[PDB]
Structure formats: C-alpha cells, structure tokens
Design a protein around this ligand. Sequence first.
Ligand SMILES: *[C@@H]1O[C@H](CO[C@H]2O[C@@H](C)[C@@H](O)[C@@H](O)[C@@H]2O)[C@@H](O[C@H]2O[C@H](CO)[C@@H](O[C@@H]3O[C@H](CO[C@H]4O[C@H](CO)[C@@H](O)[C@H](O)[C@@H]4O[C@@H]4O[C@H](CO)[C@@H](O)[C@H](O)[C@H]4NC(C)=O)[C@@H](O)[C@H](O[C@H]4O[C@H](CO)[C@@H](O)[C@H](O)[C@@H]4O[C@@H]4O[C@H](CO)[C@@H](O)[C@H](O)[C@H]4NC(C)=O)[C@@H]3O)[C@H](O)[C@H]2NC(C)=O)[C@H](O)[C@H]1NC(C)=O
Ligand SMILES: *[C@H]1O[C@H](CO[C@H]2O[C@@H](C)[C@@H](O)[C@@H](O)[C@@H]2O)[C@@H](O[C@@H]2O[C@H](CO)[C@@H](O[C@@H]3O[C@H](CO[C@H]4O[C@H](CO)[C@@H](O)[C@H](O)[C@@H]4O[C@H]4O[C@H](CO)[C@@H](O[C@@H]5O[C@H](CO)[C@H](O)[C@H](O)[C@H]5O)[C@H](O)[C@H]4NC(C)=O)[C@@H](O)[C@H](O[C@@H]4O[C@H](CO)[C@@H](O)[C@H](O)[C@@H]4O)[C@@H]3O)[C@H](O)[C@H]2NC(C)=O)[C@H](O)[C@H]1NC(C)=O
Lengths: 167, 212, 210
Amino acid sequence: LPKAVVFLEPQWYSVLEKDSVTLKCQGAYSPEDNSTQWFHNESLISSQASSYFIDAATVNDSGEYRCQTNLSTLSDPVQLEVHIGWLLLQAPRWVFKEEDPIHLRCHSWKNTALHKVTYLQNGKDRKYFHHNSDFHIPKATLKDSGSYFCRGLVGSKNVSSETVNIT
Amino acid sequence: PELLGGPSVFLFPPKPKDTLMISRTPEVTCVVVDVSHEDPEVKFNWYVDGVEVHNAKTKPREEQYNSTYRVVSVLTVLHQDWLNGKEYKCKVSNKALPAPIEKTISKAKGQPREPQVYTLPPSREEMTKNQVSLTCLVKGFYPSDIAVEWESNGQPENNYKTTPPVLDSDGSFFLYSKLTVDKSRWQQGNVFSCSVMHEALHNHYTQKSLSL
Amino acid sequence: LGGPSVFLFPPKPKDTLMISRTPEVTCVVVDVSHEDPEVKFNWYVDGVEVHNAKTKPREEQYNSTYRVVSVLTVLHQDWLNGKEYKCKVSNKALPAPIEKTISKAKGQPREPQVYTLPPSREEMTKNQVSLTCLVKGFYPSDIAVEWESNGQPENNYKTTPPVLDSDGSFFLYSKLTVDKSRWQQGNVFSCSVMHEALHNHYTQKSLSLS
Ligand SMILES: *[C@@H]1O[C@H](CO[C@H]2O[C@@H](C)[C@@H](O)[C@@H](O)[C@@H]2O)[C@@H](O[C@H]2O[C@H](CO)[C@@H](O[C@@H]3O[C@H](CO[C@H]4O[C@H](CO)[C@@H](O)[C@H](O)[C@@H]4O[C@@H]4O[C@H](CO)[C@@H](O)[C@H](O)[C@H]4NC(C)=O)[C@@H](O)[C@H](O[C@H]4O[C@H](CO)[C@@H](O)[C@H](O)[C@@H]4O[C@@H]4O[C@H](CO)[C@@H](O)[C@H](O)[C@H]4NC(C)=O)[C@@H]3O)[C@H](O)[C@H]2NC(C)=O)[C@H](O)[C@H]1NC(C)=O
Ligand SMILES: *[C@H]1O[C@H](CO[C@H]2O[C@@H](C)[C@@H](O)[C@@H](O)[C@@H]2O)[C@@H](O[C@@H]2O[C@H](CO)[C@@H](O[C@@H]3O[C@H](CO[C@H]4O[C@H](CO)[C@@H](O)[C@H](O)[C@@H]4O[C@H]4O[C@H](CO)[C@@H](O[C@@H]5O[C@H](CO)[C@H](O)[C@H](O)[C@H]5O)[C@H](O)[C@H]4NC(C)=O)[C@@H](O)[C@H](O[C@@H]4O[C@H](CO)[C@@H](O)[C@H](O)[C@@H]4O)[C@@H]3O)[C@H](O)[C@H]2NC(C)=O)[C@H](O)[C@H]1NC(C)=O
C-alpha cells in the first residue's frame, strides 16, 4: 500500500509560540471510512479529521508528526519546532546546493509590527527594510555558508532572532 | 503611545551610604514600566547568585502623560552580599511578553581603591564676595560609588553641591564637593569638614576638616 | 515611528565664541534605504528660511542604509542670542518630511567666576600634585576650560561636567596634575576660560607658589 504524507500549512516547520499550524494528511480512504490517525511522537492524538490544528502553538507541540488511514501506510514523521521569543528566522530549508533561490522571512511574535528590520549574515546586515518584509536571493555564492538572523523594533524595544545557519 | 513592545524593566543598585553603614538598609529595586491595562498583573522573581530569594516587596501606580502602569519591586540586600559580588537577578513576567525579562546587577568589579581626600580653602580672590567657596577633593577611588557630605559644628551643611565622579587617567575616580558659606563665618574661623564614605576605607568612612 | 531618523546637533562652544573659528549646525539623517537614497533638507532660522546649506552622501559601516548630513555654517552672534535652526528633512519613506529645531539654551546669560586653588599640603607628600581651577557662576553651561604651564597646553588635566546649583547657575572643576617637582620649583600654570559672558568671551587665571 501507499505511504501517506503529512504537509504543513504553512511550509514553516519552525514557528513561534502563537503560530497556528495545520497538518494536512495526504492519502487514500476506504469506502465506509473517512478517518485519519495522528501521531505526535509515539503518542496518539484523538481527532479523526484528515487535518490536525494547532491554534496557538506552545513548545510542547514541537516534535515529529505522523498521520495515517486504513488504505495508507503510516507516514514518515514531520519535525515541528516551536520556539520562544520576539523574532524567528524562517525558510523552507537552509540546505542550498550550488545554484538555488533563497527565501528568508523574519517572523515576529503574533505578527507584531516589526520595523527598521535588517537581515544579517555574519554580524553584517545583508539588507535593511523600513518595515518588515522578506529577504530574497537567486543562485548560491559558494559562500552563503553564513550564520543568519534578524533584528528590528517591536514598538520601542529592539528584538533579535536566534541565528540560523544557511549552508 | 504605541506600546506594541510590552513592559520594560530597569534594575537599580543600592546607595553607597546604605551598603556602607550597617545601621542602614541597602535595597535593590526592579522597575517595570509600560505595564498595560489589559495585561496589568506582574510577577517578579528574585535571585541572589542563582538561588531564588522570596523576601521582595511590591506596589502599583499609574502615570498620566502615557496612561500605563508602573510596577516596582524592592528587595532588601545584606551589606556583605553586595560588597562581595553576589549578583542580583530580577525576572519580570507579564502577558505582553513572549517570555519574562531578566535583569541582573552586582557591584562593580575591579581592585577597590582608597580615596584620597583633600580640603581646599576659598581662593584669595574670592573674598570680594559675601560668600566664599570651600572645596573638598576626593581622588583615586574605585569603585565610583561613594558618599561625600559636609558638616559645620557637628551638624549638616545644607549649601553644598557635588560634581559626579569623573574617570581619571590612572583609571580611577575623582570628584569635587563645593560648600558655599558666608565670608563672615569663614573669617570667623569656624570649622568645616567633608565626610567621605567609600567601600575602601578603614571603617568605610573618613573625614578631613578645613578652616583658617 | 517608521522611516529614517534625524539628529540636529549644535555648533561647538569654542567655535561660537571666537570669530576666527567656524560655527555650524548639523542635521544628520540615518536609515536611508537604497531604494530611495535621496533627501531634501529645509533650513529655517527664527522662522525665516535659509539657503546656505551643504551636503554629501555616505552609506556605510554595518548597514544597507544611507547616511545624510546637512552642514549649515552659522553667524556667531546669531546663535549667541538664540535662533531657531529648524531643520526639515524630506524623503519619500517619510509621510511628511521631519523637522527639528535647535538653539542656544535660553535663560539669562551670567558671567563665570574663575579661581585657581593651590594643592593642599596634605597632597604634596605625593609624587604628583593636583591643581584646581574653579569656574562657578555661569549661564549657560556651554563653556571651555583648559590649562597651560607655558604657552604650551597641558595634557594631564580633567574637567568635571558643568554642575547646576542653588544659585541657579553652573559651576565646574578642572583638575590638572603635575609632578610635585615642577610645582615645587616654582613654575607657572593657568586655566583659560571661554564663556559668552566674559569680556572677550575669554579669561585666564594662573597658579604659582608663595
Ligand atoms: C510611560 O511612562 C514612563 C514613565 O512616565 C513618565 O513620567 C513623566 C515624569 C515623564 O516626563 C517621563 O519622566 C516618564 O516617561 C515612561 O518612561 C519609563 O521608561 C524610561 C526609559 O524609557 C525609564 O527611564 C530610565 O531611567 C533610568 C534611571 O532611573 C532613575 O533616574 C531617572 C532619570 O534620572 C528617573 O527619572 C527615574 O525616576 C529613576 O529613578 C531611580 O529610582 C531608584 C529608586 O531608588 C533609584 O535607585 C535612583 O536613584 C532613581 N533616580 C533618581 C530619579 O534619583 C536610566 O538609567 C535609564 O537609561 C537607561 O536606558 C538606556 C536605554 O533604555 C540605556 O542606554 C542607558 O545606558 C540606561 O541603562 C543601562 O545603561 C547600562 C550602561 O550604560 C547598561 O549596561 C544597561 O543595560 C542599560 N539598560 C538598558 C535598558 O539598556 C532610563 O532613562 C523610566 O523608569 C520610566 N519612567 C518613569 C516611571 O520614570 C515611558 O516612556 C512611557 N511610555 C508610554 C508607555 O507611553
Ligand atoms: C544600522 O546602523 C546604522 C549606522 O549608524 C552607525 O551608528 C553608530 C552608532 C555606529 O556604531 C554603527 O552602529 C553605525 O555605523 C544606525 O544608525 C544609527 O542609528 C541610531 C539609532 O537608530 C542613531 O541614534 C542616535 O544617535 C545620536 C548620535 O549623537 C551624536 O553623538 C554620538 C555619541 O556617541 C555619536 O556617536 C554620533 O556620531 C552623534 O554625533 C557626532 O557627529 C556630529 C556631527 O554633526 C558631531 O557634531 C558636529 O561635530 C562637528 C565636528 O565633528 C562640528 O563641531 C559641528 O559643529 C557639530 O555639530 C558630534 O559631536 C558627534 N558626536 C560626538 C559628541 O562625538 C544620539 O545622540 C541619539 O541619542 C538618543 O536619541 C534619542 C532619540 O533621538 C533621544 O531620545 C535620547 O535622548 C538620545 O539623544 C541616538 O542614539 C545614530 O545616530 C545612527 N548613527 C549615527 C549617525 O551615529 C541605524 O540605526 C541601524 N539600522 C537599524 C535601525 O537597524
């Protein structure tokens, strides 16, 4: 039988503590059976829906997720990282092979208004934006192997984000 | 205004005079401002060298111009504990924040240096005046925390000001304290004196007098 | 609180006290994007707008931001009497350009009193000695105070910031340090003082022995 799959809505498998997360399960359902089995690291989460919803995530939602049916073989896990803090650097993956576009969003707690934002790459602000937006890049540079992270002004205070490693 | 950033905390050390005389109460105070009206409840957390202390006190108040609450907490400190380093940590917890804020404070580090005190009589050309200036000079001390007061007979000398400390060349501190007095009294030969209380004297306190 | 920021700084005291020096007001603008690296200044004085201005760009250091500064040389006595130097910075990123005004501290100009104080015996027991110059009674705090043992200026001296007191004016102290020997020999030292309420915006008192 077919191996089911868990997808994240949105593509962010790394969020902050308020972020709503949805895990859509993809697979086949039998005749008189439209149910789904959800797994959070061994533990079984009751809900039948083919969709699991995290309204306001806490760091306890972090972990590997698997979903299944009766016509789909158990899905491989999906790591969901729940972080704490004002900012958080996001991306679909920081594994960039020689040529390939980069997409960094500087997510802030409760989508709070972030201003005078700046993405940094090795203590060097790659770019500045008056208001919060996203950071783009095309092919690699065989040197993108820099530790990134962002900062800005949540209201009057300056907030920083944990620094990630785009390799 | 726009407080989308939530509360903000400001920790403060005790005062030299307190920490230096056992008869006084050295206190450390954690200040939280921008405390909302929707998320007003505030929770403090104190730690002396990591270990959590439970003997702190608080009280709320609000401010006009910005319509916000100003919550403050006051923890009493043991004279020793401060002058031995023992870092003080204040963790403020409130809804508006992703996580609590932690401020920490402790006495300035470095080789404590004994202050040298020098009294300086009014300058000759200052007689033309009805009142003349009496000067106290305290130099070569570290830390910068220090207390400098003036006395007449055996009592306070209201009229005196003191420059803040000033970082000297040899990496130490100095400052001046000017006591304004009535030409008459000086000439009359009264007796004045500046008392200096610093973390590095042989009883946390010395005094140098000055007259004609 | 969006868009770039603006910082208007006043002229230098010394520069405003002696005509041989050039006093100017600077309007600095930080946080200028590469998208719209362009800024228009508007200089107004006591209401009446001015046009002397001068400028040049410098985006650098650790930012993808641009820096902008507008120097506006100023007439000595102008500032000295007090003049609104309103600066209006304009950049699209700014809804409505930002304007900030600076000027001489207002109040009633009072003249300093300068007295030099010899090092009290107690200290002479040491290698180096302290010479005190007391400048009390000025308004504003804007002042200059330096030492000279001879035409040559001295290096080993510090000066407290101006401190405001009872009287309502400002005073400060300047401590010059000198190896006792010198002092002992019977040398000469003086602290000059530049203030707006001094005869020629200047005066100096000297220290010696005996
Ligand atoms: C909401 O309302 C609040 C307050 O209301 C308003 O009240 C009226 C009167 C109005 O006119 C304003 O005065 C006021 O806004 C408002 O502001 C609040 O936040 C500000 C900062 O934004 C706080 O100010 C801080 O003050 C400390 C010093 O505190 C004392 O001294 C000041 C000024 O001299 C007094 O006004 C205070 O009363 C404080 O009292 C002290 O209380 C203790 C009691 O025992 C005692 O120990 C002291 O003796 C006593 N002092 C007195 C009066 O004798 C400053 O030090 C702060 O500066 C620091 O922050 C900046 C950046 O934030 C740092 O760069 C700077 O360095 C200072 O901090 C540290 O420096 C070191 C090394 O340099 C670093 O290692 C540290 O990390 C660094 N800290 C930081 C943060 O980086 C600062 O100015 C103030 O407490 C609040 N107001 C109040 C209640 O006084 C707010 O903006 C307003 N907004 C809204 C919501 O609308
Ligand atoms: C990314 O990085 C940017 C790049 O800027 C650079 O900043 C400095 C700090 C570097 O360390 C690097 O980090 C970086 O390359 C950021 O720009 C900076 O942003 C901050 C905050 O967003 C701005 O903050 C204000 O800074 C001013 C600075 O005041 C003066 O004094 C300080 C003292 O340390 C100096 O550092 C500074 O240069 C300022 O003046 C200096 O130049 C003047 C030129 O006019 C001198 O005066 C003139 O001198 C002439 C001869 O030299 C001549 O005499 C003339 O007559 C005279 O006018 C002046 O003397 C000289 N300073 C001295 C004395 O040495 C602060 O005052 C101000 O402080 C507070 O501000 C708030 C709000 O206004 C207020 O409430 C408080 O009460 C204080 O007043 C601010 O902190 C900073 O100015 C920007 N850089 C600059 C130009 O310094 C950028 O923000 C970053 N991007 C982001 C947002 O992510």
